[PDB]
Amino acid sequence: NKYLVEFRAGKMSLKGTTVTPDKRKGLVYIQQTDDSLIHFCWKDRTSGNVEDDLIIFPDDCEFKRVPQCPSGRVYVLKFKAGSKRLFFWMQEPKTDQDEEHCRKVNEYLNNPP
């Protein structure tokens, strides 16, 4: 099962109206199973183990940037049908591929193979 996407990103915590990034740097990667279901997984870089693994259907979620605190790379996953929102931040040293990863994330979560 090849990974559709994969980049260094850490999870954050949103409480009330404040978003705080978690130092638990992880990896945001996507993989499609033989079931044609796209798997959105977030692994912790600490142990390199997949902490999270949720199947995301097309038009089920939206991957976009958060233009609230400009300074670094912050993206949020908006579950259109899950009614849930996740916060992530890029840990890659260069953003030369940040846009591509961002595009692939949306294309893999909204446009599965």
Partner: peptide
């Protein structure tokens, strides 16, 4: 080597 994490901020669903 690697970038440091960003500082906390207020988020509002506009």
């Amino acid at each position: 080597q690697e970038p440091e994490p960003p500082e906390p901020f207020e988020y509002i669903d506009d």
